[PDB]
Write a protein that binds this ligand. Structure first.
Ligand SMILES: Nc1ncnc2[nH]cnc12
Ligand code: NA
Ligand code: NA
Ligand code: NA
Ligand code: NA
Ligand code: NA
Lengths: 70, 283, 70, 70, 70, 70
């Protein structure tokens, strides 16, 4: 399901090598390393991302994310 | 051509800078309001310079009036300074192509770069303080200067004067921040990391702004402008993109991404990463 | 065959670590990881991409793609 | 805890495989290669980074850092 | 030999994971993985590159390329 | 030794997979894989890089490099 859709408010590399992004007021983290620079590029460029997951609770994990330009 | 930059008051100082800008540059069609614009330096032959007579260090007094800066017109670099009392032009080593008639030219061993100046001055620009009092000190140091090699004090003086003349001409942000030091409360202007960053990105900014067509924002490296008042409040004069240069590499000034005009090189520099997992594991 | 040629309408990192892009109205996915930054970059900079594949079924995989600034 | 917050003043890769960044006048280093492109991209784009560690002090290693456009 | 010097006219990720660039009207492919994003970034910014290889005919492989500031 | 401090005049991916940059008129190569995108990003943005190494003759190798904003 679409957990959150919006611009990345902040991103954060974590000590366990996971990566967090805050989208539409909620934080989500992914353990997929490949997503780190892709999310950073999206954040830098103001892409609208849609965090997708079977669990949408803020602070939850994700590995599916869509990237849209304006 | 000669202009005076009068430090007597904020009004005289800003008026001085605006008059210079008007004469040496032309407003961008798309970044101009009233007579306040981001202007492109008019093309002049290389070697062309204009002189800046420093005045008003002591408010409205014809004192401390023997300092002239020689500014290369195409890039606004201070090529050196003239002590009009001794009729001597101390010229930086990287400006031997700038010839000033009628003065004795002392070709210096020191070049004009901030890397050099900050070293010789034992003064970093980030956090550098400039006040009316230190500009007077700067003036005295330059008038006392002699020799073909910049001393610490002459270098500190050049750093300060370059900031309040050339850098302020280029960036309305520095003009605005620094001018408070000219007020009667005589506060201190402290050059910020942001001010320093702006000056380090002048060429890059110059290459991008002519492409601006009302996009929501502009991103040039570490520099961000979110709207036109931000652009205007920050930049006043840019290089003519037809020492600083307009091009670093490539030939694409910009890329419009999500209605933000990006310096293409900046985007290229964070879009050149391979797959993260492959990157980190391929040690 | 040229499956699709056009701008990337959206890209998406998937839970199975594949990456999807929508081009000229159709979605294609690739399992090649290095195509992830390459495709996101193309999407961000407005490159025309030509998805190529022996078969071009909608929602089909690909591992050949040409990138053009124009 | 938040160790330092600010743009990256410089970054440096050392022979000993540590990557230093200077933020808010203090140097911190990380040997997480994942953080190299993220930090350098933050540096060249002027992102505000917040170095975070269980304990903050000059010259300590870090592996948690938040990235903000401003 | 220096085979082609100029901007990348198009690039292409190939099915065999090699990567092709067209420079000075000739196509060249490389199996050096790392060159993929580097060549694509050169491509998007119009960076001039010089392809070096044992053979310079279109269709030749290369494992050396210089990125110029021309 | 303080080898060079300046902008990258050109970069080159070498046949042995090392990567060379020309700085201050001298060429230096590095086999440090992490440095490739970083050095190219420095070249793209005109960053001043400071290369230090045991030897500074052109053709020397290095691993240490600082990326400056000034
Ligand atoms: N001497 C100088 N004049 C103007 N801008 C400069 N930037 C660095 N050195 C300078
Ligand atoms: Na979840
Ligand atoms: Na005036
Ligand atoms: Na004018
Ligand atoms: Na450019
Ligand atoms: Na297919």
């Amino acid at each position: 399901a679409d957990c959150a859709k919006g611009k990345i408010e902040f991103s954060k590399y974590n000590e366990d090598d996971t990566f967090t992004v805050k989208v539409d007021g909620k934080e989500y983290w992914t353990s997929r390393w490949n997503l780190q620079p892709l999310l950073q590029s999206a954040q830098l460029t103001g892409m609208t991302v849609t965090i997708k997951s079977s669990t949408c609770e803020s602070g939850s994990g994700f590995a599916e994310v869509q990237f849209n330009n304006d | 051509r000669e202009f005076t930059i009068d430090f007597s008051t904020q009004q005289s100082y800003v008026s001085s800078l605006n008059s210079i800008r008007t004469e040496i540059s032309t407003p961008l069609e798309h970044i101009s309001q009233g007579t306040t614009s981001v202007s492109v330096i008019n093309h002049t032959p290389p070697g062309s310079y204009f002189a800046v007579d420093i005045r008003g260090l002591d408010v409205y007094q014809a004192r401390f009036d023997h300092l002239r800066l020689i500014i290369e017109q195409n890039n606004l670099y201070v090529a050196g300074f003239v002590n009009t009392a001794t009729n001597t032009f101390y010229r930086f080593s990287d400006f031997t192509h700038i010839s000033v008639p009628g003065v004795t030219t002392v070709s210096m061993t020191t070049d004009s770069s901030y890397t050099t100046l900050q070293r010789v001055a034992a003064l970093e620009r980030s956090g550098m303080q400039i006040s009316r009092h230190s500009l007077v000190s700067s003036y005295l140091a330059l008038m006392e200067f002699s020799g073909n090699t910049m001393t610490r004090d002459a270098s500190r003086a050049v750093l300060r004067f370059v900031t309040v003349t050339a850098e302020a001409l280029r960036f309305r942000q520095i003009q605005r921040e620094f001018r408070q030091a000219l007020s009667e409360t005589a506060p201190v202007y402290t050059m910020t990391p942001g001010d320093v960053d702006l000056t380090l990105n002048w060429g890059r900014i110059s290459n991008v702004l002519p492409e601006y067509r009302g996009e929501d924002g502009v991103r040039v490296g570490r520099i961000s402008f979110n709207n036109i008042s931000a652009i205007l409040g920050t930049v006043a004069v840019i290089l003519n993109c037809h020492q600083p240069e307009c091009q670093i590499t490539g030939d694409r000034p910009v890329i419009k991404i999500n209605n933000t005009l990006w310096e293409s090189n900046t985007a290229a520099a964070f879009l050149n990463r391979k797959s993260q997992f492959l990157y980190t594991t391929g040690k």
